[PDB]
Amino acid sequence: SLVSFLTGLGCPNCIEYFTSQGLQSIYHLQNLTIEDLGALKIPEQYRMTIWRGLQDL
């Protein structure tokens, strides 16, 4: 789901950022903040995309 998620959102290149920290679940992924995404060195371009998307779930 994580892999599909980032891909169906158009940012499979963001996958490493999460799996690099041991993040692989969608649950855990939802309670991250916009600041968290930034700490996870995620490109300022996909931050809200992802964040918004995770809010939806």
Curated annotation (Swiss-Prot):
PTM (free text): Phosphorylation by PLK1 and PLK3 inhibits the transcription regulator activity and pro-apoptotic function. Higher levels of phosphorylation seen in the brain from patients with Huntington disease.
Domain SAM, first and last residues per copy: 1-57
Subcellular location: Nucleus; Cytoplasm
Coiled coil: none
Tissue specificity annotation: Expressed in striatal neurons of patients with Huntington disease (at protein level). Brain, kidney, placenta, colon, heart, liver, spleen, skeletal muscle, prostate, thymus and pancreas. Highly expressed in fetal tissue. Expressed in the respiratory epithelium.
Induction: Not induced by DNA damage. Isoforms lacking the transactivation domain block gene induction.
Range of residues in the leader sequence: none
Role summary: Participates in the apoptotic response to DNA damage. Isoforms containing the transactivation domain are pro-apoptotic, isoforms lacking the domain are anti-apoptotic and block the function of p53 and transactivating p73 isoforms. May be a tumor suppressor protein. Is an activator of FOXJ1 expression. It is an essential factor for the positive regulation of lung ciliated cell differentiation.
UniProt comment concerning the protein's domains: Possesses an acidic transactivation domain, a central DNA binding domain and a C-terminal oligomerization domain that binds to the ABL1 tyrosine kinase SH3 domain.
Any further remark recorded for this protein: Maps to a chromosome region frequently mutated in diverse cell lines of human cancer. Appears not to be frequently mutated in human cancers, in contrast to p53/TP53. Hemizygosity is observed in neuroblastoma and oligodendroglioma. Activated and stabilized by interaction with RANBP9.
Disease: Ciliary dyskinesia, primary, 47, and lissencephaly: A form of primary ciliary dyskinesia, a disorder characterized by abnormalities of motile cilia. Respiratory infections leading to chronic inflammation and bronchiectasis are recurrent, due to defects in the respiratory cilia. CILD47 is an autosomal recessive form characterized by onset soon after birth or in early childhood.
Description of how the protein assembles with itself and partners: Found in a complex with p53/TP53 and CABLES1. The C-terminal oligomerization domain binds to the ABL1 tyrosine kinase SH3 domain. Interacts with HECW2. Isoform Beta interacts homotypically and with p53/TP53, whereas isoform Alpha does not. Isoform Gamma interacts homotypically and with all p73 isoforms. Isoform Delta interacts with isoform Gamma, isoform Alpha, and homotypically. Isoforms Alpha and Beta interact with HIPK2. Isoform Alpha interacts with RANBP9. Isoform Beta interacts with WWOX. Interacts (via SAM domain) with FBXO45 (via B30.2/SPRY domain). (Microbial infection) Interacts with Epstein-Barr virus protein EBNA6; this interaction inhibits TP73-mediated apoptotic pathway.
Similarity comment text for this entry: Belongs to the p53 family.
Protein name as it appears in the record: Tumor protein p73
Organism: Homo sapiens (Human)
Taxonomic path: Eukaryota, Metazoa, Chordata, Craniata, Vertebrata
First and last residues shown, out of full length: 492 to 548 of 636
